[PDB]
A and B are shown apart, each in its own frame.
Chain A
Amino acid sequence: LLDLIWLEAILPKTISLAQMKASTLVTNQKGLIKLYFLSFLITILISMILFNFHE
């Protein structure tokens, strides 16, 4: 009740956390090629301002 619970709390959170965050990466990418390519120009505009990329 402590040894297989409150030691089963912290490390099986890690697998559930990654499986939560592996679910937000594929299921939001179901086609819609209009929505792909507007995000690639977001990548090419954020690279100008943000950092040492022009200096």
Chain B
Amino acid sequence: MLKYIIPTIMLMPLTWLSKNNMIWVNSTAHSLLISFTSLLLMNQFGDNSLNFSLLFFSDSLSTPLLILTMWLLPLMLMASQHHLSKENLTRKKLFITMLISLQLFLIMTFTAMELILFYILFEATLVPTLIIITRWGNQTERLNAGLYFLFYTLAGSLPLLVALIYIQNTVGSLNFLMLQYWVQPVHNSWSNVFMWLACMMAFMVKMPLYGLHLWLPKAHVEAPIAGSMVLAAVLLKLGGYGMLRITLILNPMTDFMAYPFIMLSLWGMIMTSSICLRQTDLKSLIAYSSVSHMALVIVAILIQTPWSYMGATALMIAHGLTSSMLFCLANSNYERIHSRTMILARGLQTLLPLMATWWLLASLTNLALPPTINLIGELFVVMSTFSWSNITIILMGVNMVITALYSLYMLIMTQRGKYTYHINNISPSFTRENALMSLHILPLLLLTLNPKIILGPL
């Protein structure tokens, strides 16, 4: 990024500097102009590699990944205006600035050129997201969930500084991933096991496992106003890509102990899907779906040998658009019914026929309709782990069968009769409710036309 952080930091002295209610139409207007500058200088060729300028950017050469990072800020401001307009103007503008500040660290992140600038940017988040949970959230039991939102990610990430500086003083310098040509092998010891352990375990804190993931249905359950930072929390979970940066080198040959990370993420994969068919919350309903086929990608990486890097490149953005779109469905149907419990929503499909199409195609991305960006990568996870052994198709295939029920378990809940109630919930899906509901599948199937850019090195 030559000048990508440079225009967007100038957007910050524009919120409180501006007038009254013009601040929404002004902030969205400037924001889309950067989106072309993202597209233009990137997407170049391309053969190993594009070292961008200097010691602050390697241009995201092997995986682009950065276009998706920039849709969301001109996408959530139209969403957050549902229930925010009740406060002072100076307090509302602070809520605008902290979300814009969230993007700037993540703009320098995902490229990052290095590793010692990585970790300070890997931890540069969690400061604005935590404040969003504290002020202007929902009802109580927020503050413990704010503490569970800490004390896991910070608990696991601290041995990375134990790991990385131990590498920096030992073999060369980790400023350059491309000066990582000389890499000594790592043998089996009782010291080197922990060297691989601290190198990996912090990345399991963000993309979850069957262990240590109780915090994840707290921030999504107890969540801000109407899915406001919850959409950003989608990129916060998928943005643990850095295992692709690190373990591609830097003890690759330790696979003797890969197995309890293969197995735990596999029986826990089939389990946490069925752990929500008796759940009674809408915002928890997509949350446990977002565990399962996000836990699919982990066995695509620790198992090496591409035809596995191909799909895993695409499976990060797979639910990254989809679960963001499902939260947009769940952020709607709450300004009209002020409880998020799904059972009270009997008698839909007749009052809102226009958004009923949007329920269909959204949940048609979990069955996923094989000419899409979802079942084009899940076939390559099949193509990899079947070469591992012949058993792996069984537990992974039932995951394609449980979410078949688990997605249509939501769709049929819309179709009921006589609705018993609801002198409120009149509003027949205004312009903000459906224009914001667009621009998700509209690039998604667009990317299914020529899906060449969604591919790693690989």
A interface residues, Cβ below 8 angstroms from B: 3-4, 7-8, 11
A3 to B208, CA, bound (A): 14
Judged by a CB distance under 8 angstroms, whether B211 is at the interface is yes
Closest to B213 in A: A7
Whose C-beta in chain B lies nearest to the C-beta of A7? B214
Asked whether B211 lies within 8 Å of A7 as measured between CB atoms, the reply is yes
Q: Is B275 an interface residue (CB 8 A)?
A: yes
**Which B residues touch A4, using CB under 8 A?**
214
A-B contact pairs, 7 of them (CB 8 A): A3-B214, A3-B275, A4-B214, A7-B211, A7-B214, A8-B214, A11-B214
A10 to chain B, nearest CB (A): 10
A-chain residues with CB within 8 Å of residue B275 when the two chains form the complex = 3
CB distance from A14 to the nearest CB of B (A): 10
List residues of chain B with CB within 8 A of the CB of A8. 214
- How far does the alpha carbon of A4 sit from the alpha carbon of B217 in the complex, in Å? 11
Task: Return chain A residues, CB-CB under 8 Å to B211.
Answer: 7
A12 to chain B, nearest CB (A): 10
The CA of A7 and the CA of B214, in the complex, are separated in Å by 8
Give CA–CA (A3, B278) in the complex, Å: 13
Q: Considering only CB atoms and an 8 Å cut-off, how many residues of chain B contact the other chain?
A: 3
Interface residues in B214-245 by Cβ distance below 8 A to A read: 214
| CB proximity of A15 to chain B, nearest CB, Å | 9
Which residues of chain B (259-283) have a CB below 8 Å from chain A?
Answer: 275
Give the residue name and chain of the B residue nearest to A11 (CB): B214
In the complex, A16 Cα to B214 Cα: how many Å?
A: 18
Q: Which of A4, A8, A11 has the most CB of B within 10 A?
A: A11
- Bound-complex Cα distance A11 to B214 (A): 10
| Cα(A8)–Cα(B212), bound, Å | 10
| Per-residue A-contact encoding for B201-216, CB less than 8 Å = 1, 0 else | 0000000000100100
Docked Cα-Cα span, A11 to B218, in Å, equals 15
A3 CA to B275 CA in the complex, in Å?
9
Q: Which residues of B contact A11 (CB under 8 A)?
A: 214
| A7 contact set on B, CB distance < 8 A | 211, 214
Which residue from chain A places its CB closest to the CB of B148 in the assembled complex?
Answer: A11
Residue of A nearest to B272 (CB): A3
The residue on A at minimum CB distance from B275 is: A3
Residues of chain B within 8 A of A3, CB atoms compared: 214, 275
Please measure, in the bound complex, the distance between the C-alpha atom of A3 and the C-alpha atom of B214, giving whole angstroms. 8
Which residues of A are found within 8 Å of B214, using beta-carbon distances?
3-4, 7-8, 11
- Nearest CB in chain A: distance from B439 CB, A: 35
A4 to B211, CA, bound (A): 11
Q: How far, in whole Å, are A11 and B148 apart by their CA atoms in the complex? A: 11
How far in angstroms is the closest Cβ of chain A from B52?
Answer: 42
Instruction: Determine the distance from Cα of A11 to Cα of B211 in the docked complex, in whole angstroms.
Output: 11
Residue of B nearest to A2 (CB): B275
Q: Which residue of chain B has its CB nearest to the CB of A8?
A: B214
A9 to chain B, nearest CB (A): 11
**A8-B148 Cα distance, complex, nearest whole Å:** 12
CA–CA, A11 and B275, complex, Å: 21
Inter-chain CA distance A19–B214, complex, in Å, is 21
Bound-complex Cα distance A7 to B275 (A)? 14
A53 CB to closest chain B CB (Å) equals 30
Given the complex of chains A and B, what is the CA–CA distance between A3 and B291 in angstroms?
14
How many Å lie between the Cα of A5 and that of B451 in the bound state?
44
Q: How far is the CB of B149 from chain A (nearest CB, A)?
A: 14
Give me the 5 closest cross-chain CB pairs, A-B, nearest first.
A7-B214, A3-B275, A4-B214, A8-B214, A7-B211
Docked Cα-Cα span, A12 to B275, in Å, equals 22
Closest B residue to A14 by CB, please name it: B151
Give A4 to B275 CA distance when docked, in angstroms.
11
How close is B303's CB to chain A, nearest CB, in angstroms?
Answer: 27
Q: Which residue of B lies closest to A3 (CB)?
A: B275
Complex interface residues of chain B between 26 and 73 (CB less than 8 A to chain A): none
Give the Cβ gap from B196 to chain A, nearest Cβ, in Å.
24
> In chain A, what residue has the closest Cβ to B288?
A3
Nearest CB of A to B209, in Å: 11
Return the chain A residue nearest B271 by Cβ: A3
| Cα(A4)–Cα(B214), bound, Å | 7
Minimum Cβ distance to chain B for residue A8 (Å): 7
Complex-state Cα separation, A6 to B442, whole angstroms: 43
Complex CA–CA separation, A7 to B211 (angstroms): 8
**CA A8 to CA B218, docked complex, whole Å:** 13
Q: How far is the CA of A11 from the CA of B147 in the complex (A)?
A: 13
Residue among A3, A4, A7, A8 facing the most chain B CB atoms (10 A cut-off): A3
